[PDB]
Enzyme design. Structure first.
Site, short mmCIF file in Angstrom:
data_model
loop_
_atom_site.label_atom_id
_atom_site.label_comp_id
_atom_site.label_asym_id
_atom_site.label_seq_id
_atom_site.Cartn_x
_atom_site.Cartn_y
_atom_site.Cartn_z
N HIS A 129 50.03 10.76 46.80
CA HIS A 129 49.34 12.03 46.95
C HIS A 129 47.93 11.87 47.49
O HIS A 129 47.23 12.86 47.64
CB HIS A 129 49.33 12.83 45.65
CG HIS A 129 48.54 12.21 44.55
ND1 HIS A 129 49.12 11.46 43.56
CD2 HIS A 129 47.22 12.27 44.27
CE1 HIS A 129 48.19 11.06 42.71
NE2 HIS A 129 47.02 11.52 43.13
N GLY B 165 40.04 11.25 39.54
CA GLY B 165 39.67 10.07 40.30
C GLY B 165 40.24 8.75 39.77
O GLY B 165 39.98 7.70 40.38
N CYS C 205 43.50 8.02 39.41
CA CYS C 205 44.80 7.69 39.98
C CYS C 205 44.73 6.42 40.80
O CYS C 205 43.78 6.17 41.55
CB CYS C 205 45.32 8.84 40.85
SG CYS C 205 45.95 10.09 39.75
#
Lengths: 301, 301
Positions: free
Chosen positions: A43, A143, A145
């Site tokens: 993503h 932030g 991920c």
């Protein structure tokens, strides 16, 4: 009396040297840089993250869509591919700090260490057990991920988790490095049903044994429940079925208490402790594994 | 509902690169290698560790009494000196991985990260709060002496702890890097009175605020206790006196609940939760700090 048991993580050194920052347009997150490959959540390609078409996004991208910085350098992207919920970027330089490593899948009740990172900068480490509904009770913010979870055998790092999401109940999930998500989850900003959690029986047993190894054993009676009889109890009572291991066997040997004695105990304690304490808790604890107990209290790998 | 709060440690990378093995005759333990100095516990000089004369031991030693190996090299010892309960060995080469660092003293209720090591090999990291009786609830085995605890401000490491002993109740203590032991303890294999622990009030308040930031607030009434009135309660009830900080102030601002509202709450909860849960516990939790809550739930340093 203190039990000697703490939430203990591997030293994060070897993995810190593998963390990078990946930016694709508006979105920035963490990647894992091994050999000539950088892994990161897909993503990062997405602007409107609900029902996005990663296949179309992927094709829309060229090698120059992706920027990868080492803070702890700049890596030129010479490849890009998607595997499940991960991107697999190829870069021109191989990470000279690449550890000996494997990829693996962790199972419910198993423990692993997480290196939490923001902007490619390592910021904290902690350890979790994969829950029976394939979430973890972690500590992740926007932030985060791309942070990674891993186990360690000898010098070999076993990467098992790349962080992807927070569920409504505040737990977290991510994917394995085959790109599959743990559980039935999907990496889209949509409502998802979380499954029910369960107590991890093998780990509650490990904990009762840790109490015993600390002198706390009021809950041990001579009575006994068979594994089979317990596992039929468990299915009605939000406990996992119990499967013994050599590590649980060592504990039964060292203390001279039989698995079946504690299975019975669990059955009684579940209803109530009766105002007593076990290792300073008044509820069953399932966040420590038989290996944690073997290593931290007895020195046994 | 999961609170987002975990026992989180700093990444251990920078410190791992500073750990060495120190051997003096029969005894082997860990040291910390910064610049041209190696720090380690002084009982490495001792064979019969009860009422030993470290002053006589020290003089009995020459530079060739001490062997220092890096596993994660061999350092030639060109100096040796004793400061309180630590040796200060000088070696011929300066650690090229030496971080920016300071030494400091941690205070009761403050958190710090520990890098546990055996034979100079980093093996695990965890985080503890210095208890009010100047022990920690750690996880240390034979051979763990010389492991270090530290905090981190920006890139600067603040070394605060070098591990020395296990007390009868299973907790641990060590020294600061001025060589003083935390608490009234001594580094001899003798019986020592442990002082009484206390709940850390500032940290129980941080925890109640963490509950609130997670939607859990049944325990908040309009009632109030003044700090002063609470601190006189505390002295009769095994709680520390409470001292507010800007970090606790941020939490009162973000949630709109006054310190004094939770001080009153603590007073009521201490007697009994009344079969209710707070963040999945049924006893007051004092192992998380106001800074932990600010950072892990809100992003605030």
């Amino acid at each position: 009396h203190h039990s000697g048991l703490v939430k203990m993580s591997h030293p994060s050194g070897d993995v810190e040297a593998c963390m990078v920052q990946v930016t694709c347009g508006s979105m920035t997150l963490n990647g894992l840089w091994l050999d000539n490959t950088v892994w990161c959540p897909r993503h990062v390609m997405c602007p409107q993250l609900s029902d996005p078409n990663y296949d179309a996004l992927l094709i829309s991208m060229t090698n120059h869509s992706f920027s990868v910085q080492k803070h702890i350098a700049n890596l030129r992207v010479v490849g890009h591919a998607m595997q499940g919920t991960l991107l697999k970027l190829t870069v021109d330089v191989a990470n000279p700090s690449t550890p000996a490593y494997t990829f693996t899948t962790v199972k419910p009740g198993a423990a692993f260490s997480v290196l939490a990172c923001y902007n490619g900068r390592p910021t904290g480490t902690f350890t979790v057990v994969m829950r029976p509904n394939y979430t973890i009770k972690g500590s992740f913010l926007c932030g985060s991920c791309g942070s990674v979870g891993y186990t360690k055998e000898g010098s070999v790092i076993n990467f098992c988790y790349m962080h992807q999401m927070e569920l409504a109940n505040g737990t977290h999930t991510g994917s394995a490095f085959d790109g599959t998500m743990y559980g039935a989850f999907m990496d889209k900003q949509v409502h998802q049903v979380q499954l029910t959690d369960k107590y991890c029986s093998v780990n509650v047993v490990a904990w009762l044994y840790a109490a015993i190894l600390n002198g706390c054993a009021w809950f041990v009676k001579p009575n006994r429940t068979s594994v089979v009889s317990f596992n039929e109890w468990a299915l009605a009572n939000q406990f996992t079925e119990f499967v013994g291991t050599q590590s649980v066997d060592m504990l039964a040997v060292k203390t001279g208490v039989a698995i079946e004695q504690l299975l019975y105990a669990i059955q009684q304690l579940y209803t109530g402790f009766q105002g007593k304490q076990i290792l300073g808790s008044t509820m069953l604890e399932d966040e420590f594994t038989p290996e944690d107990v073997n290593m931290q209290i007895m020195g046994v790998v």
